Ligand binder design. Structure first.
Ligand SMILES: *C/C=C(C)/C=C/C=C(C)/C=C/C1=C(C)CCCC1(C)C
Length: 137
């Protein structure tokens, strides 16, 4: 596969329900759903090394990892975590997270390249799954 590209969001489902699981109050959940409508992902893949830049209108973050080696990022609601990415198949990776301090719901994410040229990202908290679909810019 090659995940590299500038990806633009075309669909986003269940994001508000994910944030509710994470304890975000109602008004901020709605504002965040609106922000996710400008969600853009820039990926550069070199083998199993990934450089990913995730951004909205006012915020941008970089996530750099190599498949199979632990790294530190943050969960969706912003708590620091230790993460480990593995392949599930040729075109799908899955990341398990574990909080660096304290307790909280079990979180994870996936990225998948479909045969139709889409990028599907999922984010999970407990048993609520958010699905976001992107196309190349
Ligand atoms: C492989 C993809 C990864 C690691 C993406 C992570 C994305 C996020 C933590 C996104 C968070 C967002 C918010 C909390 C509010 C604004 C909209 C998002 C989706 C960018």
């Amino acid at each position: 596969p090659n995940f590299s590209g500038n990806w633009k969001i075309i669909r986003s489902e269940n994001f508000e329900e994910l944030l509710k699981v994470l304890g975000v109050n109602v008004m901020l959940r709605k504002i965040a759903v609106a922000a996710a409508s400008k969600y853009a992902v820039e990926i550069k893949q070199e083998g199993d090394t990934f450089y990913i830049k995730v951004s909205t209108t006012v915020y941008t973050t970089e996530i750099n990892f190599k498949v199979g080696e632990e790294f530190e990022e943050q969960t969706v609601d912003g708590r620091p975590c230790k993460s480990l990415v593995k392949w599930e198949s040729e075109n799908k990776m899955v990341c398990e997270q574990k909080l660096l301090k304290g307790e909280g719901p079990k979180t994870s994410w996936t990225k998948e390249l479909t045969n139709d040229g889409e990028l599907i990202e999922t984010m999970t908290a407990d048993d609520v799954v958010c699905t976001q679909v992107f196309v190349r810019e």
